[PDB]
Amino acid sequence: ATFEIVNRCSYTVWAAASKGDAALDAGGRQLNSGESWTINVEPGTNGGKIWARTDCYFDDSGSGICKTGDCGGLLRCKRFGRPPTTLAEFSLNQYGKDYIDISNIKGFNVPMDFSPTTRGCRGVRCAADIVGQCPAKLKAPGGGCNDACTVFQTSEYCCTTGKCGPTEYSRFFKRLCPDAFSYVLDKPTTVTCPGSSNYRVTFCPT
């Protein structure tokens, strides 16, 4: 499957793509304002994620640091990034169907649209000013708006027992971005697309 990753933000982002134990494609690249990066994701990929990283410094070997979404200091991510990270999540070719969603379970750093470029399903977006409106206790110094699990590490926010409810903090994310997951047991906002669809992820869509 092809994903075109587009940076419409006015600032540089460092895109990342991983399935948690391996890179997808090259795993990461710098995207200046307006740049597009096309990656190929193997069919059958389960549990893939794409995110943006902000305020990164990398040396010649591709080693460095980012203020949001750092993936163990590497330009080319093999593992998932440090919150806060708005996430585009996907599982491809799962019994004939692809499943896509956007998630704020690991917080929010950059607004995002995640849409098919082929026919037969709808896209999803979270493009509100979550950082500007972020509750004081969730604001990340480096930028972004952390989720409450990351900040407080309780069973209720992390849904550790498999039982949890919405919270004042999850409801903040949900109010601003209804079509994104706000906590682990949120009513799913997953979209079902035809197997083998292609997609575009746009940072700062509006």
From Swiss-Prot:
Q: Which UniProt keywords apply?
A: Cytoplasmic vesicle, Disulfide bond, Signal, Taste-modifying protein
Task: Please give the organism.
Answer: Thaumatococcus daniellii (Katemfe)
GO CC, sorted alphabetically, is: cytoplasmic vesicle
Q: Which CDD domains match?
A: TLP-P
SMART domains for the chain? THN
Tell me its family. Answer: Belongs to the thaumatin family.
This chain's protein is named Thaumatin I
Where in the cell does this protein reside?
Answer: Cytoplasmic vesicle
